Amino acid sequence: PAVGIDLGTTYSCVGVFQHGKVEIIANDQGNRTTPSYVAFTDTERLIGDAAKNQVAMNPTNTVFDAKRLIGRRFDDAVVQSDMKHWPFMVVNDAGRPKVQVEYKGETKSFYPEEVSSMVLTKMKEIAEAYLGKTVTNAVVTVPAYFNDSQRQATKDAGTIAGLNVLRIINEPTAAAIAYGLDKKVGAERNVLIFDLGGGTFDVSILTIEDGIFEVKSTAGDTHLGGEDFDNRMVNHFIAEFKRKHKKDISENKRAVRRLRTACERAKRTLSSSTQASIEIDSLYEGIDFYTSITRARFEELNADLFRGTLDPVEKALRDAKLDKSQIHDIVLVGGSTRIPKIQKLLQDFFNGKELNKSINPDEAVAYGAAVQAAILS
Amino acid sequence: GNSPQEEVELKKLKHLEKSVEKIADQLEELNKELTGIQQGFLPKDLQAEALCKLDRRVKATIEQFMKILEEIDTLILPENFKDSRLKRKGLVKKVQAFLAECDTVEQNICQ
Ligand SMILES: Nc1ncnc2c1nc(NCc1ccc(Cl)c(Cl)c1)n2[C@@H]1O[C@H](CO)[C@@H](O)[C@H]1O
Ligand SMILES: [Cl-]
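Above: inputs. Below: predicted complex with 3BK.
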């Protein structure tokens, strides 16, 4: 057995190509993705869902977003600017970052690939629970814009975890492989991969001719995702509470959290029907918040954000010296790409060109990495 | 006009009411240990460590209550589902009162 692992910033996914078909493995809790979270307590280490569930009770010794620190030096613009927003401690070990935590009372410290090996041990254990075999061979994916140190740091993380890293494959190369784009014939084909997740937005241009891939260009927005769309709804409904009850809910953490959770869920509902209802009883000062939002209202709240997803697209094409007319395939990955308006904008950019979106966009990178680990295996 | 579908909702709410009862028992357990630990037994540095262990567990209780709320907040009950709507709201206010109990504890120990 050989597995493909998407090692995500927020969540990870493991596939195995078996019986002519990729099976995206469900974890011990029944979920097809696993949060890339690790928590240290008085008594034990928690990885995945167990580590995410308890991030409110222990935010200090709960580590995440380690993929933003892996392979980087300590004064990377990026390590510096995300350190500002992480409850866990990033220390400087002679210019390399290490996460410091409290674990059974002893203060412990860990390089990001020790934290990332933890998640890879999780994903590996996960697949072995489904298969009832030992699992050691894997393909692990990285972002196309990853450098040598970042590629090697990830490979290491796998090796520390007991895996045999058959290869490190870029995420868009993984997605493209999922859609049998490497199987097409003859003439060279340009491929735009549109990766919009919960928190980031990555654009890639790749070329494929005869099953041979090259990265052309890389763009994106490091802090645009579904979380920004949830906030636009939160603002909308806070202003609406204020209009109907003349109450300001926004300094109530638990009311805003309740609202925001109903927002995120209603948003998903809006990718598949045209109106979402919400009932939150006793939201603030005992007052029931019953409301409803249409897909057009949700779209309008996010209008600038949806269309601005096109400036990394145009900008990736600039960098690749390609006319928007010379992209032969468009592929959608990351969960926020279910939003119809976004699928629509994009089609209407590529003068009405079709899109590859039939494989669950949360699952497509691990799918492709599965398909490729079986071939390399 | 009692309908078969309302029974579905009343069953969810009953399942949620029994979880709520588990966390309320945890909250009772915490208050009991609080009372006993503040009751002098340990040197004050060691009490502090004990009280911070409880604090973290009150935090988990708060969290567990929030997760129940979040799931209650997924229900859509027609106006004619009067029995369900009353149960949903009874339950929300129960949790909310329990949440005040937690804050009261958490607010005092381990800062
Ligand atoms: N149908 C959808 N419409 C709009 N956005 C969706 C979306 N699905 C997701 N993500 C995946 C998802 C599926 C099921 C669940 Cl219960 C969850 Cl929490 C997330 N997202 C967003 O993708 C990001 C990664 O999860 C998140 O922003 C999520 O809200
Ligand atoms: Cl997900």
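The pocket of 3BK (ligand 1) is lined by residues A 197-198, 225-227, 264, 267-268, 271, 335-336, 338-339, 362 (CB under 6 Å).
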